[PDB]
A paper describes a structure:
Additionally, to avoid the formation of intermolecular disulfide bonds, resulting in the risk of protein aggregations, we substituted two cysteine residues, C53S and C187S, to generate untagged [name]-YAC53S and [name]-YAC187S. We also determined the crystal structure of [name]-YAC187S at 1.95 Å resolution. Superimposed structures of [name]-YA, [name]-YAC187S, and [name]-YAI183Y, using CCP4MG software, showed no significant differences in surface epitopes. We found a water molecule present in the space between helix I and C187 of [name]-YA, as well as between helix I and S187 of [name]-YAC187S. That water molecule does not impact the intramolecular interactions in [name]-YA, but coordinates the interactions with S187 on the helix H and E214 on the helix I via hydrogen bonding in [name]-YAC187S(dotted lines in Fig. 6B), likely enhancing the protein stability. Thus, the highly polar nature of serine together with a slightly smaller footprint of oxygen from S187 may be the cause of the water molecule positioning in the fashion to enhance hydrogen bond-mediated intramolecular interactions in [name]-YAC187S. Thus, the results here identified a less flexible loop region between helices H and I (R5; residues 198–221) in the [name]-YAC187S and [name]-YAI183Y, compared to [name]-YA. In contrast, the Tm-values of [name]-YA were significantly lower, 57.5 and 58.4 °C for histidine-tagged and untagged [name]-YA, respectively, indicating a stability enhancement through mutagenesis. However, [name]-YA but not [name]-YAI183Y and [name]-YAC187S previously incubated at 37 °C for 24-h had 1.6-fold lower levels of recognition, compared to those proteins prior to incubation, even though SEC-HPLC did not indicate significant aggregation or degradation (results not shown).
Lyme borreliae produce other outer surface proteins, including [name] (also known as BbCRASP-228,29). [name] promotes bacterial dissemination to distal tissues by evading the complement system, the first-line innate immune defense in vertebrates in the blood, through binding and recruiting a host complement inhibitor, factor H (FH). Additionally, [name] is only produced after Lyme borreliae invade vertebrate hosts and, as such, induces [name]-specific immune responses after natural infection. Similar to [name], [name]-YA is an all-α-helical protein composed of nine α-helices (denoted as helices A to I).
Residue numbers in the entry: 19 to 235
The structure:
């Protein structure tokens, strides 16, 4: 008759991912807070060696010490491992290699550390969206699948504006939907309000399709 058995399998798969990934944004925030000074010091004091070399060495030490930062990224990778097997792995290797090679003094290497980090930060955000993209694409409900495409696009446009703020919104919003908490569609922001609201509008549309499925189960 109907496809309730299938729709329930889809809700189940989405709910598992979201609950398993619920600390993803907090974990990226902890990387950002530890590394932001070190990133900016590399960008500043490597733009021209004149020199602050001691500052650059110390900045590199924050990214390298006890492989802590690399392992924090691997912890995020392990969260999305089931879903996007090779998304992040190359970019984590690239960073690891730059860190391995940065035995100073070498600004280019120091700038390569900073760029490989920034690129990896943005990938960790896209990885979450890509996982939801793969999950949503297994939905038998065509209205949900259409609403999911619109969400991923607005999600990605939001990432371009600010990767950590975008990831925080995506995680909280998807979280609200699978826990049946009504999504607020308004941004109260002073920075990035336009793109946040575009993203929140696509999430209200998705919440609509999600509820329409849920109400038949």
């Amino acid at each position: 008759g109907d496809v309730s058995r299938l729709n329930q399998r889809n809700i189940n798969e989405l709910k598992i991912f979201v609950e398993k990934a619920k600390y993803y944004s907090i974990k990226l925030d902890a990387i950002y807070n530890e590394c932001t000074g070190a990133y900016n010091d590399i960008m500043t004091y490597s733009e021209g060696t004149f020199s602050d070399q001691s500052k650059v060495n110390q900045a590199i030490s924050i990214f390298k010490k006890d492989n802590k930062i690399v392992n924090k990224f691997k912890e995020l990778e392990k969260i999305i491992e089931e879903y996007k097997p090779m998304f992040l792995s190359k970019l984590i290797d690239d960073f690891a290699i730059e860190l391995d090679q940065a035995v100073d003094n070498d600004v280019s290497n120091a700038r390569h550390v900073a760029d490989s980090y920034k690129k990896l930060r943005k990938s960790v955000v896209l990885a979450y969206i890509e996982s939801f993209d793969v999950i949503s694409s297994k939905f038998v409900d065509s209205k949900f699948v259409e609403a999911s495409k619109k969400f991923v696009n607005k999600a990605k446009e939001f990432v371009e504006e600010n990767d950590l703020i975008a990831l925080e919104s995506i995680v909280k919003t998807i979280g609200d939907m699978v826990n049946d908490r009504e999504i607020n569609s308004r941004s109260r922001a002073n920075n990035f309000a336009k793109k946040e609201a575009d993203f929140l509008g696509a999430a209200v549309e998705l919440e609509g399709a999600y509820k329409a499925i849920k109400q038949t189960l």
